Protein backbone atom coordinates (compact mmCIF):
# COMPACT_ATOMS: atom_id res chain seq x y z
CA UNK A 1 0.00 0.00 0.00
CA UNK A 2 1.18 3.60 0.72
CA UNK A 3 4.57 2.61 2.23
CA UNK A 4 5.20 0.23 -0.70
CA UNK A 5 4.28 3.03 -3.14
CA UNK A 6 6.63 5.49 -1.40
CA UNK A 7 9.33 2.79 -1.33
CA UNK A 8 9.09 1.85 -5.04
CA UNK A 9 9.15 5.60 -5.82
CA UNK A 10 12.42 5.90 -3.82
CA UNK A 11 13.81 2.77 -5.54
CA UNK A 12 12.85 3.98 -9.03
CA UNK A 13 13.97 7.61 -8.62
CA UNK A 14 17.28 6.49 -7.12
CA UNK A 15 17.73 3.70 -9.72
CA UNK A 16 17.32 5.90 -12.78
CA UNK A 17 19.52 8.76 -11.45
CA UNK A 18 22.07 6.08 -10.37
CA UNK A 19 21.98 4.81 -13.98
CA UNK A 20 23.27 8.15 -15.32
CA UNK A 21 26.64 8.25 -13.50
CA UNK A 22 27.05 5.29 -11.16
CA UNK A 23 25.55 1.85 -11.81
CA UNK A 24 21.90 1.68 -10.62
CA UNK A 25 22.80 0.70 -6.99
CA UNK A 26 25.10 3.73 -6.40
CA UNK A 27 24.70 7.51 -7.07
CA UNK A 28 27.99 9.23 -8.09
CA UNK A 29 28.63 12.68 -6.47
CA UNK A 30 27.29 14.38 -9.64
CA UNK A 31 24.06 12.38 -9.36
CA UNK A 32 23.79 12.81 -5.57
CA UNK A 33 24.27 16.57 -6.05
CA UNK A 34 21.73 16.73 -8.87
CA UNK A 35 19.24 14.50 -6.98
CA UNK A 36 19.45 16.73 -3.89
CA UNK A 37 19.18 20.02 -5.87
CA UNK A 38 16.46 18.68 -8.20
CA UNK A 39 14.31 16.59 -5.82
CA UNK A 40 15.22 17.46 -2.17
CA UNK A 41 14.66 21.19 -3.01
CA UNK A 42 12.11 21.86 -0.23
CA UNK A 43 14.07 19.97 2.48
CA UNK A 44 17.56 21.22 1.48
CA UNK A 45 18.19 24.42 -0.44
CA UNK A 46 20.20 24.18 -3.70
CA UNK A 47 23.80 22.94 -3.60
CA UNK A 48 26.36 24.46 -5.97
CA UNK A 49 29.09 23.25 -3.56
CA UNK A 50 30.54 20.16 -5.30
CA UNK A 51 32.73 20.05 -2.16
CA UNK A 52 29.74 19.58 0.17
CA UNK A 53 27.85 17.01 -1.92
CA UNK A 54 31.14 15.06 -1.88
CA UNK A 55 31.47 15.62 1.91
CA UNK A 56 27.93 14.44 2.83
CA UNK A 57 28.42 11.47 0.50
CA UNK A 58 31.94 10.76 1.89
CA UNK A 59 30.41 10.79 5.39
CA UNK A 60 28.29 7.73 4.38
CA UNK A 61 30.40 6.35 1.47
CA UNK A 62 31.23 2.83 2.73
CA UNK A 63 32.55 2.01 -0.79
CA UNK A 64 34.87 5.05 -0.78
CA UNK A 65 34.39 5.35 -4.59
CA UNK A 66 32.90 8.88 -4.75
CA UNK A 67 29.32 7.55 -4.86
CA UNK A 68 26.70 6.60 -2.23
CA UNK A 69 25.05 3.17 -2.34
CA UNK A 70 21.27 2.73 -2.15
CA UNK A 71 21.85 1.58 1.46
CA UNK A 72 23.65 4.85 2.29
CA UNK A 73 20.91 6.80 0.49
CA UNK A 74 18.27 5.00 2.63
CA UNK A 75 20.35 5.81 5.75
CA UNK A 76 20.50 9.49 4.69
CA UNK A 77 16.74 9.43 3.98
CA UNK A 78 16.18 7.91 7.45
CA UNK A 79 17.73 10.82 9.37
CA UNK A 80 16.34 13.47 6.97
CA UNK A 81 12.84 11.98 7.30
CA UNK A 82 13.28 11.73 11.10
CA UNK A 83 14.17 15.45 11.27
CA UNK A 84 11.06 16.15 9.19
CA UNK A 85 9.04 13.88 11.54
CA UNK A 86 10.33 15.92 14.51
CA UNK A 87 9.13 19.01 12.59
CA UNK A 88 5.80 17.28 11.90
CA UNK A 89 5.13 17.03 15.67
CA UNK A 90 4.39 20.76 15.18
CA UNK A 91 3.26 20.97 11.51
Amino acid sequence: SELEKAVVALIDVFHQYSGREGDKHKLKKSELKELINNELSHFLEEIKEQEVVDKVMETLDSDGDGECDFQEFMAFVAMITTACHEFFEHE
Binding site: E49, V56, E86, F87, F88
Partner: peptide, 26 residues
Protein backbone atom coordinates in the same frame (compact mmCIF):
# COMPACT_ATOMS: atom_id res chain seq x y z
CA UNK B 1 49.05 32.62 14.07
CA UNK B 2 45.45 31.40 13.75
CA UNK B 3 44.95 32.87 10.26
CA UNK B 4 41.71 32.25 8.29
CA UNK B 5 43.49 29.41 6.45
CA UNK B 6 40.61 26.95 7.04
CA UNK B 7 38.91 27.24 3.62
CA UNK B 8 37.49 23.80 4.60
CA UNK B 9 34.81 25.58 6.71
CA UNK B 10 31.35 24.13 7.45
CA UNK B 11 29.80 25.15 4.10
CA UNK B 12 27.44 22.24 4.90
CA UNK B 13 25.58 24.69 7.20
CA UNK B 14 24.30 26.55 4.08
CA UNK B 15 21.94 23.60 3.39
CA UNK B 16 21.92 21.69 6.70
CA UNK B 17 20.39 24.79 8.39
CA UNK B 18 17.01 23.50 7.15
CA UNK B 19 17.68 20.08 8.73
CA UNK B 20 18.68 21.79 12.01
CA UNK B 21 15.47 23.86 11.78
CA UNK B 22 13.35 20.71 11.31
CA UNK B 23 15.21 18.98 14.20
CA UNK B 24 14.54 22.15 16.27
CA UNK B 25 10.89 21.16 16.89
CA UNK B 26 12.01 17.81 18.42
Amino acid sequence: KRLRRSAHARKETEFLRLKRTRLGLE
